[PDB]
């Protein structure tokens, strides 16, 4: 009965769903007694409404698409390629949805889903969970990558043209035969394997080889850069030419 008074005391302070769970988390010994469970049943109908708001707010975060979200901007900062970034951003939301559902099982006890309130919230969580599938994103990338057919190939060097200020003719700068997207596939495949998606073995080959070619590729552009950087010294002083 004293705890029942405390059960009045603790909830009146807490308005957020998370807040009630913490104080509720403390009462670990009293889940055996069906006296406090009734006093929990006094509050139960409120807590489904509270966690519904968190899942609503979690859904609101999902309403803003990943590219719009701040996560995409700062994932780009943190050498996280886009397709993996969208997957990771979705995966965390699904986990935090699952985290809220576990609290409900703690709040409402085992067999909570049988509750009329439990059926409704479970239906709401399931629909949001379906929307958070990350297999759909990975599969499209595998198709699109195979359409692109990435491979360095060609030559070790494939020169390209650049317009330089102060020179009327285009200045050809030696470049390692390479494409910017080839960086991403090395990071995408590396990310996806950890995430758990089974990358196609073909794309696996194209990505690691570029990764294994990257040390030699950057080793060569040093020689290009150094040979370049040496040349402007010669351009500076025509005497030593």
């Amino acid at each position: 009965t004293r705890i029942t008074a405390r059960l009045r005391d603790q909830l009146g302070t807490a308005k957020n769903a998370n807040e009630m769970f913490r104080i509720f988390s403390r009462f670990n010994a009293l889940f055996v007694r069906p006296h406090i469970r009734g006093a929990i049943r006094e509050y139960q109908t409120q807590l489904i409404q509270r966690v519904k708001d968190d899942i609503e707010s979690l859904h609101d975060k999902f309403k803003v698409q990943y590219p719009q979200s701040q996560a995409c901007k700062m994932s780009h900062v943190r050498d996280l390629p886009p397709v993996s970034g969208s997957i990771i951003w979705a995966k965390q939301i699904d986990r935090q949805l699952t985290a809220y559902m576990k609290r409900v099982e703690d709040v409402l006890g085992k067999g909570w889903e049988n509750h009329v309130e439990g059926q409704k919230l479970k239906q709401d969580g399931d629909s949001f969970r379906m929307k958070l599938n990350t297999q759909e994103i990975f599969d499209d990338w595998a198709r699109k990558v195979q359409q692109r057919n990435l491979g360095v190939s060609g030559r070790i060097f494939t020169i390209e043209s650049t317009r330089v200020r102060g020179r009327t003719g285009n200045v050809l700068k030696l470049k390692v035969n390479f494409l910017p997207e080839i960086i991403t596939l090395s990071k995408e495949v590396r990310n996806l394997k950890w995430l758990g998606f089974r990358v196609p073995l073909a794309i696996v080959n194209k990505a690691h080889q570029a990764n294994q070619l990257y040390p030699f590729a950057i080793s060569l552009i040093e020689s290009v850069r150094t040979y370049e950087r040496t040349c402007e010294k010669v351009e500076e002083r025509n005497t030593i030419s």
Binding site: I159, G169, V171, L172, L174, C231, S241
Partner: peptide
């Protein structure tokens, strides 16, 4: 007087070589 080919002239030579291939 042997002089190193300029970057532009040597690269135009390499352009000519690549283009015909």
């Amino acid at each position: 007087e042997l002089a190193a080919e300029d970057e532009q002239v040597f690269l135009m030579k390499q352009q000519s070589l690549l283009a015909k291939q």
